[PDB]
Amino acid sequence: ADATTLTEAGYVGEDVENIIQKLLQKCDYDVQKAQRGIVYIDEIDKISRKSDNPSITRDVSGEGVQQALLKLIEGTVAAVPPQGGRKHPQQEFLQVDTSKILFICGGAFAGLDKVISHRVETGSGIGFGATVKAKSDKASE
Amino acid sequence: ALPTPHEIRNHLDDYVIGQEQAKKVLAVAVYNHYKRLRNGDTSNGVELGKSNILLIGPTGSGKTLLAETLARLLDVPFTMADATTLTEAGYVGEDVENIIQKLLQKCDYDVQKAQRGIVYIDEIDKISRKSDNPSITRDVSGEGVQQALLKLIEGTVAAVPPQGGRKHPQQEFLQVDTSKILFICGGAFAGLDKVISHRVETGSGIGFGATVKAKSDKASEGELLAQVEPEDLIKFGLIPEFIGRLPVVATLNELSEEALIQILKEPKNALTKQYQALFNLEGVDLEFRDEALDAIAKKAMARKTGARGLRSIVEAALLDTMYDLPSMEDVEKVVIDESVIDGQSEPLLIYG
Amino acid sequence: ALPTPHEIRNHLDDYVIGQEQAKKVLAVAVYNHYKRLRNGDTSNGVELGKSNILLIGPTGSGKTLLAETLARLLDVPFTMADATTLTEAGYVGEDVENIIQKLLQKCDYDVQKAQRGIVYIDEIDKISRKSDNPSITRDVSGEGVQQALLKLIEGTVAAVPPQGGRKHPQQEFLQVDTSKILFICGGAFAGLDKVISHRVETGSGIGFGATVKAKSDKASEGELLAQVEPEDLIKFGLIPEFIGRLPVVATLNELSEEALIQILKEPKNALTKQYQALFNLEGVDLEFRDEALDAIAKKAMARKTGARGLRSIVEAALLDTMYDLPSMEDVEKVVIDESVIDGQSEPLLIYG
Amino acid sequence: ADATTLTEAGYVGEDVENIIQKLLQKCDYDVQKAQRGIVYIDEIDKISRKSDNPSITRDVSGEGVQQALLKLIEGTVAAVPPQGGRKHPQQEFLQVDTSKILFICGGAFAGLDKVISHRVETGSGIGFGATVKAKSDKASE
Amino acid sequence: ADATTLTEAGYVGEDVENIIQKLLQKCDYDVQKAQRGIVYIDEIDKISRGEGVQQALLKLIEGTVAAVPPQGGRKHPQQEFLQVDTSKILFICGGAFAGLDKVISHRVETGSGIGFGATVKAKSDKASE
Ligand SMILES: Nc1ncnc2c1ncn2[C@@H]1O[C@H](COP(=O)(O)OP(=O)(O)OP(O)(O)=S)[C@@H](O)[C@H]1O
Ligand SMILES: Nc1ncnc2c1ncn2[C@@H]1O[C@H](COP(=O)(O)OP(=O)(O)O)[C@@H](O)[C@H]1O
Ligand SMILES: [Mg+2]
């Protein structure tokens, strides 16, 4: 899955809970196999929290999406309708625990180098005995 | 029968001490407000006007406490807010219509009864302009908030979203009228005394021919605030159109060491009674000697913490006993004195 | 038959005292507007066009009061708006088209009635450029509001929800043309006198050849406002395109002591009449001596808050009285005189 | 139409494509007639990107409207509501090309004279070699 | 929660109530259980100097009623919104005041830090701290 597509529940974008349902589709909706499955949330950095914008009605993507994903890591059974259940509820709600499901989040955190450097960069001195750092060997990601 | 000012003042006296003048203004205003609501039919041609209150007093003088002590008896919906949070419309901070939203929560989102409610606005001092501002920056936290409140206080229909929503082209709005909704803006106008001190004793000239007959006198900040006039607020930074919406002004004097001692035992919800009841349920009586109360007040004044600091002082003094009292046995009563405050002697424990 | 301007002024002067010039413009505009509605056929080759009004005046001068009094006799729907709430399109603040929605609510969402309705936009001075013509950052709450209103005042096909957004699907936004909708903007332009003074005054210099002007012989606020011109408003912050939509400008002078005295008793809903009825239900009569009213007018002028200052003076005088009045027995009448205004004396209490 | 109400797509304010919607109403939602329609975008001078503004901010009210209108003036297919009823279930996007529609934009540019004067005069200064006119001999607006 | 997250100063009301909403998730969205919950904060020294941020924070500690949606959902009306009083919730505002130790030494110990007689024993032991 990709965090970019994911949005807060009840919105036009997507719902985070369908990730468990997508995993079940691979193993034909069996909880035993699903529990041992692995999840890969690509582009995790794209859902980084952002400040509120007056023009935008609400920030559906951001910390709100991170809370739904965090709930699965804490460990919670997720209700999934099997065999593509009809709109009628019928109380199927297959419970799949998320404590044993491996969660992997892989994203390219562009710009993180800037904040990290500000914290671990000693700086360049000015005196004769100081250490001068040229831009060539300054640092790298 | 509508409660008379004496009855309302008695309730305020139980929880608030040293603000006799403030209680009268709020008590009569609440009584007059009920009369206006009671006279809501208004068979006579005359239309009863609305007068708002402006509580100006130092921090820790019980300005907020007066508002909280009214919700207990107040029949109409009452709520509290903060002016600092409010901001001009069209900005990311906030909007002034949220004040009605908070009031709507208490009234079960019923606009009919909400129109007869009372509102309180805290920290209004932060909204004042500092000085000589060209306004090119388009100040939002300050002057912008005042301009929006003008119509609100005098009375205008306001579009309030249902809940947890921001203004947008959507039709999720509730038309609420603030004509009959009272407003009590309370803030600590720090520095206003200097403005009043200037006008009263500005003097004229410095040289030999000058008139320096006026002599600066040492007066308490509360005493000086009584001489405040609208002209002083204009210099502080408040728009003249805003004061007109608040005709009634009441000032609260600063608390004294003697008053702090009274606050420890006289109030119905006194701090001392809270710890006593905490121990009474366990089965061990608690008593505080007057020797400790005097020392407790001195510590607060010494540290300038005020009435709020009283909680911290009591916590430290009883920290040792509270930790050991539940585990300990055969403790019928505990006696505290001034020796406990300084820490030289542990609180006396009585054994049964 | 349509009411003549004199008849309209008769109703307006009942509640407004001293605003002779304002009443004439409003009465003539209202009378002319009715003629245009009666001329809906428009058989004449020329098509009649509306002229807008701009009511300038200090605080407590009767700007907002005139709008409320006019609605009492307006056959067409009338609504009041707040410029502060309005913001540029695409922002959290309310849009300018919402004003048309409020008018529609009054006439049962009837586009025909709304098209011939009257609109009032209070606090129009708030939406003004803050003396920064470039406007580095978009002033959505300021200059942006004016731009949105530029085409609305002259006429635009506004889009609004059909009936308070019953269901968002199939909106079918109603089309309303504001070409024939009269607009009456009003606000207190604080600081405009400084602009007009610079242009009219000769100026001042420091050298031998310059002309020195004494502080005593200087133009007053009322005097400068009478000489207001469109060029002056442009410097204040308004856009030139905006004034063009408001050809008629009617300024309001500051209320004098004589006018303030009349306001206390002459209008239908005065301060004295308000408190008089307030006490009548309680069973005690209220009598205000003529000398006392004159003293209140002088004290109010010092407050610089306009007519609203009178309410503060009366409340302070009767603050203690109202606090103890209900508990008292058989108080048949109360008398207030000049001795009570300054505070040296206490109001007299007559016992039956 | 007025450019003031228009804003960049994806925001609460009305989109630029709504202009075509207004044109369609005049011809009773006739796509053929709409292609031959004429438009008058008044207040075009108000939608102007502020050259002096914070760099990291999106001027949806300004430049955003200009950018979106680029394809609308040159010619492009724009999706609009189906009809006055605004049927939501039915797709009925009524694709209309804007390649044969004339757009007569108009606005009163305030302050443009001050910009033109900078290029035309080229003589402002304080020294002997500068040109001083006293505003009496300066060119008019 | 962290003070740096809430230093935005824009619509602070929605984030302060968002904290209890996060707490409500753990307690099965039970108002009574949420009131008994313990909330923690850290890095309070950073906001001390935004002054405005402190104005909003004190209200949460003093006690305030915050409306929250009922266990998420697609949408819900103002009536269904759950309101939890924060007066019964325990708030712990943690922090690390590195520079405060110097202020205390100035007030309690000698007010000399540069001269010959001053104490500049910055050995990094920090035992006296
Ligand atoms: N000419 C007047 N005649 C009678 N009462 C008046 C008059 N002017 C003011 N008042 C009283 O003062 C109150 C406030 O007057 P307003 O017209 O609302 O002042 P204002 O022009 O709105 O000032 P702004 O708009 O806040 S700057 C009215 O409700 C009346 O009670
Ligand atoms: N007479 C009093 N009796 C009891 N508490 C008081 C009294 N006066 C002030 N207080 C204390 O003051 C606090 C409220 O004041 P506060 O909210 O700080 O006012 P403001 O916010 O307007 O400065 C309460 O915690 C209350 O205990
Ligand atoms: Mg007004």
Automatic annotation (TrEMBL), chain E:
It comes from the Bacteria. ATP-dependent specificity component of the Clp protease. It directs the protease to specific substrates. Can perform chaperone functions in the absence of ClpP. Component of the ClpX-ClpP complex. Forms a hexameric ring that, in the presence of ATP, binds to fourteen ClpP subunits assembled into a disk-like structure with a central cavity, resembling the structure of eukaryotic proteasomes. Belongs to the ClpX chaperone family. This is ATP-dependent Clp protease ATP-binding subunit ClpX.
